[PDB]
């Protein structure tokens, strides 16, 4: 939805990264209600990418604009005008949060209005023409998706909006309980859910379709994508919601997509967090996780790898996919079928064989699991050229192999809020390890408190206190009358049940002394026992050595999302393998089996070190060498002593092509010539 | 430098640099402000010849201008008029005595030709030349009094 | 002030599955150990049972749907995984399920052979229209604590089954108060309170009984030696 | 003054072999040659003091150094 | 709410929303509309009030 | 040690493996040991576990800014495919655990091994070699658990009473032990103040000379009238260090890791770091440090001082609606009053706050943070900048607790994102400079023992003043401290104090000015004569091992590297496209002509000054008589 | 069900009165399990006689120093609070300690009554001045644990008396650690290891053993319940 509505300032004809300057790419008081000035990448393409505003639409000439009340007299009025940057400096608009009394009329005399030069002032409310439509008129669709915005630094806004943005669909979803107004509408107009046409009646379900008969009495059949790879490689599953028979009307939603629940995007989970360190486990930013989420796959993901090949033709003939690869064991091509294709449902291991095929010269050159893959064989798709397969030219045949990989939270996997509070999963506890309420219920994640004050997030802290009080109910007296606080309250959040969801939209929401006093308000626990105080602190017992910790310790809920950077493809690893060719040095990627580079900086903090050895061997025998890499691997293979390098190579091919510009260069000893 | 001198112009140097980090909370020792403002005036420019075979106007090695010098006074001779010049690290680089180096980071074909009809000897003293060939550099483990 | 009153232990019942359990007098300062030391057996090492692997009939692999049921194979297994049973005996177990046409196939229609029973037949599993048949074949295996699905090449080679990750715990819910029922104050004790909520395949006072017997012979390392 | 028990690569103390040589680069030569030589009597004085099940010469080396059973001579 | 099967998530906003949230992909389709000239586009064109949009 | 994945190690040593395979003959062709070792056919792992042992493994983070940032380490295997990194070694890498990659190498010949373990291996490279302050030393979590270890409370449990003609003292106890027993029952609290009969931990020197005529040794009882968290913090040290009897602030442990990295060997210090880390740990998962709305605590006075200013920013819109005022000097003046509200809203949150409250409990202990954050958080944001880098007048009167309105929002943006954007530049500048000095220090290398001159640069100690007293330089730790003397220390009396060619450390420098010496003339490498590189005496002792520099070790590439690393802590040219900063150090290496240049005096003498009406002449009467 | 291997206990002893224990190898995460328990009972587990109550004369009141002594009166309470004291009947006893002369006055000089010993009689309690004297009455009996000063509203029927903190365990100090140990291709097991120091009423051996058995009995209060379902080894 995000990639739909992104703003290019560079491509064809615009600007590049290489050479913008920060005028560009700098905020700019004319961007306000039109692009967003938080939802923005975070690496060279700062500034110059950027996110359509929710209420922006653009002009016909191509100019965005975005829409205000008109104001006149003092009163606000209901007329909407669209107004472009040029138009709108033109007039004088003031702030929707400004009140406003019966039919329309500012209440105080003195407004927040902006002004021609980006300016806010407090003019006088008869000094008005225009104003914001809602609080949120500036933020985009990811930015809004923020509970409590306006308590979160800039930085970590951003980052918050960038990481909901790579956040994993996992194998169930669930709602967030401290929510905005925006997850419904960004899910339905996301795409992903299936949403019915027309008002009817559901007459079949199936995890494949669902069929509905109108009013009108004209039918329509839905099909589900079912375990569909998505571009990125993660599961595109969607899912009936609805039951047989059920009233469904025009635009209800009638199935789930990959991270929706009840039509509403659902992208992490809710886990209960304490805010405390614990035992350096969750030192600089790292986290700590019960067992708990593991074994019940709360944050479990399936990510689905493509693999091709293809039998093509040459100068000596043709290519054959086939069984009959020679000279490999009659096991290892067991689970392959008659064509040669590896059979559905096969568990296939790292380096196992995917599609046998042989070329002239025959040849082994068969498809097989890359380095560190692993999964089931999940679908099969063939295409022949004797089947019209409209495939290019020099090929006879193409197999697209679908490996589905389950894959549990592990160590060194990152996980992050909504606030910008990434981390990297330090440990996993076991249930009884970690620190359990006095109910006996344990903690589910551990974040630690010298994060918070330092990166002025604090709105994940109140999320969590709003998070308890969203699992747990609450209940406002009202016997005697309405309390002071509780006074802005809307009648219908005086009380509600366990588990009721909330939303606290990014610039209208809960304020300090509501969330407070609903703190003070929550309903006991199945016991009868209130777990957690005013404060939202809780006194937490040790579950290592079993005494409760000496201060209570705040505790809540705290929605968690499960990032693209998971640790299984991240990893690299070598000893020796291909090499360039043109020149001899090693190669570097991801699925090649690359080694690390080692730059200048490097060679020069071992020279700092003095260690001439270790650097030469860096240089010369792991880079350049030849003859040096295979006499060391051989040492090494048959245990004896590492040769020591005598004149180097490069040094002899540098001194022959001098000599060749006719150079007279000469070896020099310390006592003379030689 | 031409008030107070080469060694003042050092300390000078020296203060300033440490003044500015000074200012900014920063806690380098002046040792390294040092061994980086001994390279600044490493060299001197030639004013007459003497007895020697400098050339004038060349810039030359202090430790280079002052043995020859003792040797040329110790032989009867007059020894070369020197004249100190403070240069910044870019231009100091620049003016480096190892031929191999400035081959790696000048003109080449300029360096080769000045260093082949002059006959320099490159004595490996850095530690870039002799990544250039590929030798063990000569700091720490790798000197001959270690190897 | 020395005691020569020994503790004494004793049972609460507050619903079919869970229990306070009090033992009292103990020394000060002493209850909190005690209680934590039982709920980390408690939680840790109480055996049960639970499934290890299941098979259904136009099933290869667990990223599959089956005609004319609303679930996919993997909701399936992830609503399978509330079935809680209770294997009298260690070897594997094979259970059956069948089902046809319209209706809510539950934990009740499993029809399991002698030994072993579910305890919750209400639980959902499936939902099946009218071109909906299900057939389930379940193992079922006795364990402790928790075991991640068995990779299937390496517990068999048998392909279409489909291992699940077993959790093998009849333990639900363990917390304890310890209070300062010191006698008169005179002198101190204290008094430990353990509250024991289990998923009704096993009493708190049979789980309590095995954690105790768990301790009991570890901490005996010491009586061993002179 | 004392210390506690070297764990792993730490024994022996990195200070007890300085106090045997010019620099730590002088040690860094004196332990590796003698490795070399106890590797190649392994293939081919031997280790001089009693080794371990599976230990490498430099660990050899190290602790010979610290026994004050080796002898050199700087370039 | 103008979504039938919404979820009832209670809100702590006090000031009302005078105006819904757009389509979040006209931006998108609203502009190939007008590229190849569909006749919702026109009649919306025109609604606006521009002179024979072509 | 480091922790390696089990995976990762088994690929990096893989021909160490099929060796062993081939000589346990787990495998009987070396060319079948590659495919058992290529399948991770079980048997391999257990063969792994004694190849890996006692071979180090080289660790770097990007970018390696200076020397530490590659380190050796011990591996040992672990589950999972992360490597776990020693939390006192993340300084040095600069390095935190939001998502962080780290490559590892593995050297080979017994050359290369030997260079890891003696040169490179971690725990014999406490010391930063810029400034020789340690780096490898407690860090937020752990300091915030030794400050509240060694914090003393009053009127907490079991604290100490005086004789009161009905009982003793009531606060004693005949061992730490004891302490221990009376703490574990809730009696005694760690933070309260007792007497404690302690014969394991030596005493402090004011106390040793007065208790033992011949010193205290192992056994000897002595009365310490501190808590029983300093006692157990005090245990951690060496058995010869006197007792400290202090709140550990970050600045106190430093010191004192001073004392041991000056005074004990370096595998002393290094163990004793890792008790403060365990120690450190612990206390901060019990100091009950945590963060919530009610912690975040807004001063009352808030509001009185917001509507003082107001009313002073009305009189300015009066005066300037009056004619009286420019539109630029309106800014200006709003901008200094709302900065002077700024402070005071500071000051008066500094002053609400409890000492005990978590969160300015971080702060001050030193661990992370500062105050002008903790204003941020809950005083007010203050003034922003617009995108030209302005104040805008009107500041952001709202805290992060309250949250801000739409618009304050909105005009925070604009520093964010130039935040932001302005980094790379800012890093690249950095590295530029660094690279220049690496350029020019190529061949600068301690070549010989000494050149044997006697030159030499004065450096100032101290500064008589007024009293004529010990007024010693706060800088003097960066000019004189580690370095060579050059001449003899003398008083006005003929008498020597310190010898030619010591090496000035602390203890020198109290020396010097217990004997009221001012200045001192020192070897530099400014004046070193030697003819090639530089000498050791002239430069002085390494600063990361504390020693005279061992020849051959390169002080040419540490010193670039040491004035480079820091370079982003400096204020950076205009990227808006005389501030000092980069821009100025810059300008001093590259011997460029000032742009704020100064005339200097060519001949000492008198000044007769001739100002004009918009320029000045001087002219300088030579006391020497010349021209 | 049978488990991998059951551990061993093997003993190290820095002191002839501090050892140091290893349970090796253990189940993961059973080290937490045994380790804080057997701590709590080898403190407070084990009963031991301990010097309850003093009166020195001299300083009936205004207890700050008495003449003849150069030890203040709580320097001399510290003294005696280390006195390793052995009682055989539960019933308080009151014993008593006299000196004249000078010279020194150690734990030696007391003789206990038919059934109560002194293990450190070298322990010296006072330095005695020149035709100094100190006399001093202590009661004693018998407890558990560690106890704080005695309230000891009931006194003013009897003056000088000083209530002092007991330390009735025989175990003066435990510290226990938790490490991985590698049992297979598996990582990750308990190494639990304990220092335990004690005074010398008492060995190591000996208090480890009979916390053990407490222990043992404690938890067998469980398995009273019903037997089935333990693990066997
Ligand atoms: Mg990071
Ligand atoms: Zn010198």
């Known amino acids: 939805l995000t990639h739909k509505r992104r703003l290019s300032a560079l491509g064809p004809g615009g600007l590049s990264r290489e050479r913008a300057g920060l005028e560009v790419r700098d905020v700019h008081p004319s961007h306000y209600g039109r692009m967003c000035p938080i939802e923005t990448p975070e690496g060279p393409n700062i500034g110059l990418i950027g996110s359509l505003s929710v209420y922006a639409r653009v002009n016909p000439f191509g100019f965005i604009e975005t829409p205000y009340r008109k104001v006149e007299n003092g009163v606000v009025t209901d007329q909407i005008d669209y107004l472009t940057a040029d138009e709108e400096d033109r007039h004088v608009v003031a702030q929707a949060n400004s009140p406003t009394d019966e039919n329309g009329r500012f209440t105080e005399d003195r407004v927040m209005v902006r002004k021609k030069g980006g300016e806010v002032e407090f003019v006088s409310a008869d000094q008005v023409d225009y104003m914001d439509v809602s609080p949120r008129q500036m933020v985009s669709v990811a930015t809004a998706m923020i509970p409590f915005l306006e308590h979160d630094d800039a930085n970590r806004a951003l980052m918050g909006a960038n990481m909901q943005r790579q956040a994993v669909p996992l194998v169930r979803s669930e709602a967030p309980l401290v929510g905005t107004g925006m997850e419904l509408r960004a899910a339905i107009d996301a795409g992903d859910v299936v949403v019915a046409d027309k008002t009817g009646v559901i007459e079949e379900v199936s995890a494949d379709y669902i069929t509905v008969m109108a009013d009108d009495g004209t039918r329509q059949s839905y099909r589900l994508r079912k375990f569909a790879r998505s571009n990125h490689g993660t599961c595109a599953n969607q899912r009936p919601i609805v039951d047989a028979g059920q009233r469904v009307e025009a635009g209800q939603v009638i199935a789930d997509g990959p991270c929706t629940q009840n039509g509403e995007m659902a992208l992490g989970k809710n886990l209960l967090v304490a805010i405390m360190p614990w035992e350096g486990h969750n030192y600089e930013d790292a986290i700590i996780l019960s067992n708990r989420l593991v074994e019940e796959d709360v944050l479990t993901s399936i990510h689905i790898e493509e693999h091709e090949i293809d039998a093509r033709d040459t100068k000596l003939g043709a290519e054959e996919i086939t069984r009959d690869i020679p000279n490999v064991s009659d096991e290892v091509l067991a689970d392959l079928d008659e064509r040669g294709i590896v059979r559905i449902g096969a568990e296939v291991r790292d380096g196992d064989i995917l599609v046998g095929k042989v070329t002239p010269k025959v040849r082994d050159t068969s498809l097989k699991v890359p380095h560190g893959e692993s999964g089931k064989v999940i679908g099969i798709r063939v295409f022949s050229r004797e089947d019209d397969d409209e495939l290019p030219a020099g090929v006879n045949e193409l197999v697209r192999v679908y490996v589905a990989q389950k894959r549990k939270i592990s160590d060194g996997d990152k996980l992050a809020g909504r606030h910008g509070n990434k981390g990297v999963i330090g440990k996993i506890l076991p249930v009884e390890d970690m620190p359990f309420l006095p109910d006996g219920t344990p903690v589910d994640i551990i974040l630690n408190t010298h994060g918070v004050p330092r990166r002025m997030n604090i709105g994940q802290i109140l999320e969590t206190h709003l998070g308890w009080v969203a699992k747990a109910g609450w209940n406002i007296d009202v016997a005697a009358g309405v309390p002071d606080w509780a006074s802005k309250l809307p009648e219908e959040l005086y009380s509600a049940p366990a588990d009721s969801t909330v939303a606290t939209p990014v610039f209208d929401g809960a304020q300090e002394g509501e969330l407070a006093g609903l703190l003070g308000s929550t309903l006991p626990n199945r016991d009868g026992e209130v777990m957690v105080d005013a404060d939202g602190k809780s006194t937490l017992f040790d579950g290592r050595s079993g005494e409760p910790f000496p201060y209570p310790v705040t505790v809540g809920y705290m929605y968690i999302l499960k990032l693209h950077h998971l640790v299984d493809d991240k990893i690299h690893a070598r000893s020796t393998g291909p090499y360039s060719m043109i020149t001899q040095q090693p190669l570097g990627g991801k699925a090649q089996f690359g080694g690390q580079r080692f730059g200048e900086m490097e060679c020069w903090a071992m020279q700092a070190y003095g260690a001439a050895y270790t650097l030469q061997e860096l240089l010369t025998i792991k880079s350049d060498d030849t003859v040096g890499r295979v006499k060391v691997y051989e040492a090494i293979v048959k245990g004896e002593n590492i040769p020591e390098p005598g004149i180097p190579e490069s040094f002899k091919v540098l001194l022959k092509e001098l000599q060749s510009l006719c150079l007279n260069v000469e070896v020099l000893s310390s006592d003379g010539a030689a | 430098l031409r008030v107070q001198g080469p060694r003042e112009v050092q300390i000078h140097l020296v203060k300033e640099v440490q003044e500015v980090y000074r200012a900014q909370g920063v806690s380098i020792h002046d040792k390294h402000i040092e061994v980086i403002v001994r390279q600044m005036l490493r060299r001197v420019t030639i004013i007459d010849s003497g007895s020697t075979e400098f050339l004038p106007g060349s810039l030359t090695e202090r430790a280079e201008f002052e043995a020859e010098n003792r040797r040329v006074v110790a032989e009867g001779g007059e020894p070369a008029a020197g004249r100190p010049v403070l240069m910044g690290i870019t231009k100091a680089s620049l003016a480096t005595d190892s031929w191999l180096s400035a081959a790696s980071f000048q003109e080449t074909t300029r360096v080769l030709t000045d260093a082949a009809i002059n006959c320099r000897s490159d004595k490996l003293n850095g530690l870039k030349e002799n990544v250039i060939i590929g030798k063990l550099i000569p700091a720490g483990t790798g000197i001959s009094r270690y190897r | 002030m020395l005691i020569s009153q020994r503790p004494t232990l004793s049972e609460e019942t507050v619903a079919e599955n869970r229990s306070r359990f009090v033992i009292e007098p103990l020394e000060p300062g002493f209850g909190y150990t005690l209680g934590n030391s039982l709920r980390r057996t408690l939680l840790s090492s109480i055996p049960g049972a639970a499934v290890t692997s299941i098979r259904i009939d136009g099933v290869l692999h667990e990223f599959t749907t089956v005609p004319g049921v609303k679930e996919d194979v993997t909701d399936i297994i992830l609503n399978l995984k509330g079935l809680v049973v209770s294997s009298d005996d260690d070897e594997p177990v094979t259970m059956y399920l069948r089902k046809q046409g319209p209706g809510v196939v539950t934990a009740g229609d499993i029809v399991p052979p002698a030994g072993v029973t579910v305890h919750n037949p209400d639980m959902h599993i499936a939902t099946l229209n009218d071109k909906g048949k299900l057939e389930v074949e379940l193992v079922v295996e006795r364990g402790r604590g928790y075991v991640p699905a068995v990779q299937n090449k390496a517990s068999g080679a048998e392909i279409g089954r489909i291992p699940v990750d077993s959790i093998y715990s009849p333990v639900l819910k363990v917390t304890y108060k310890v209070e300062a029922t010191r006698v008169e104050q005179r002198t101190d004790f204290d008094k430990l309170i353990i509250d024991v909520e289990t998923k009704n395949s096993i009493s708190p006072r049979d789980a309590l009984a095995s954690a105790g017997g768990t301790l009991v012979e570890l901490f005996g390392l010491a009586r061993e030696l002179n | ?75 | 709410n103008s979504v039938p099967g919404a979820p009832n998530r209670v809100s702590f906003a006090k000031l009302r929303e005078p105006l819904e949230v757009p389509g979040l992909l006209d931006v998108q389709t609203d502009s190939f509309e007008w590229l190849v000239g569909s006749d919702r586009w026109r009649q919306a064109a025109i609604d606006r009030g521009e002179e024979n949009p072509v | 040690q480091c922790g390696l994945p089990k995976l990762m190690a088994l690929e990096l040593f893989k021909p160490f493996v099929m060796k062993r395979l081939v000589d346990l003959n787990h495998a009987q062709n070396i060319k079948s040991a590659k495919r058992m070792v290529e399948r991770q056919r079980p048997q391999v792992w257990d063969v792994l576990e004694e190849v890996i042992a006692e071979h180090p493994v080289l660790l770097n983070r990007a970018p390696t800014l200076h020397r530490l940032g590659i380190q050796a380490f011990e591996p040992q295997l672990v589950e999972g495919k992360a490597i776990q990194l020693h939390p006192l070694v993340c300084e040095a890498f600069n390095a935190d655990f939001d998502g962080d990659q780290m490559a590892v190498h593995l050297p080979l010949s017994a050359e290369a091994q030997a260079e890891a373990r003696i040169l490179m291996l971690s725990s014999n490279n406490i010391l930063s070699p810029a400034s020789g302050k340690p780096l490898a030393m407690p860090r937020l979590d752990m300091v915030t658990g030794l400050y509240y270890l060694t914090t003393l409370v009053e009127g907490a449990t079991g604290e100490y009473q005086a004789a009161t003609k009905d009982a003793p003292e009531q606060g004693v106890y005949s061992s730490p032990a004891e302490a221990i027993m009376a703490m574990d029952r809730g009696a005694l609290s760690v933070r309260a103040k007792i007497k404690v009969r302690l014969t394991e931990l030596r005493p402090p020197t004011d106390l040793e000379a007065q208790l033992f005529e011949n010193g205290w040794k192992p056994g000897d009882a002595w009365t310490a009238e501190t808590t029983l968290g300093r006692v157990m913090f005090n245990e951690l040290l060496p058995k010869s260090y006197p007792f400290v009897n202090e709140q550990m602030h970050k600045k106190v442990q430093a010191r004192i890791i001073n004392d041991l990295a000056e005074r004990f060997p370096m595998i002393v210090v290094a163990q004793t770091v890792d008790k403060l880390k365990d120690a450190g740990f612990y206390w901060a998962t019990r100091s009950g440090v945590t963060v919530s709305m009610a912690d975040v605590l807004v001063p009352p006075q808030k509001q009185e001082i917001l509507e003082r200013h107001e009313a002073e920013a009305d009189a300015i819109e009066r005066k300037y609606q009056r004619g009286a005022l420019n539109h630029t000097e309106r800014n200006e003046s709003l901008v200094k009053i709302w900065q002077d509200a700024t402070e005071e809203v500071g000051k008066a949150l500094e002053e609400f706050y409890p000492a005990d409250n978590p969160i300015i409990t971080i702060v001050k202990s030193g661990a992370t943070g500062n105050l002008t954050q903790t204003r941020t958080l809950a005083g007010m944001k203050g003034l922003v900048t617009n995108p030209k880098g302005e104040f805008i007048p009107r500041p952001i009167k709202s805290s992060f607790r309250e949250g801000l309105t739409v618009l304050e929002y909105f005009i925070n943006t604009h520093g964010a994102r130039k935040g932001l954007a302005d980094t790379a530049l800012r890093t690249a500048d950095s590295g530029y400079l660094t690279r220049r000095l690496v350029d020019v220090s190529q061949d600068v290398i301690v070549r010989e023992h000494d050149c044997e001159t006697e030159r030499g640069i004065n450096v100032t100690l101290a500064e008589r003043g007024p009293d004529g007293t010990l007024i010693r330089d706060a800088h003097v730790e960066t000019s004189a401290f580690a370095r060579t003397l050059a001449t003899d220390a003398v008083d006005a009396n003929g008498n020597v104090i310190i010898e030619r060619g010591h090496d000035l450390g602390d203890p020198a420098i109290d020396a010097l000015l217990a004997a009221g010496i001012t200045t001192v003339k020192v070897r530099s490498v400014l004046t070193c004569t030697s003819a090639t590189g530089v000498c050791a005496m002239c430069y002085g002792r390494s600063m990361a091992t504390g020693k005279l520099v061992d020849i051959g070790e390169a002080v040419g590439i540490v010193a670039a590297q040491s004035i480079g690393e820091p370079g982003t802590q400096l204020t950076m040219r205009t990227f808006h496209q005389i501030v000092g900063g980069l821009p100025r150090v810059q300008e001093l290496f590259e011997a460029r002509v000032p742009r704020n240049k100064a005339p200097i005096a060519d001949v000492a003498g008198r000044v007769r000054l001739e100002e004009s009406d918009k320029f000045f002449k001087i002219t300088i009467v030579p006391d020497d008589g010349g021209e």
């Not at chain 4, 009693?50 to 660990?59: D, F, I, Y």
């Open chain 4, 1 to 75: 003054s004392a210390y506690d028990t070297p764990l792993g690569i730490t024994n022996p103390p990195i200070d007890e072999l300085l106090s045997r040589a010019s620099s730590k680069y002088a040690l860094v030569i004196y332990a590796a040659k003698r490795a070399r030589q106890i590797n190649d009597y392994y293939n081919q004085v031997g280790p001089l003091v009693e080794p371990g099940l599976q230990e490498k010469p430099l660990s050899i080396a190290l602790r010979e150094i610290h026994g004050d059973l080796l002898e050199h001579t700087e370039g």
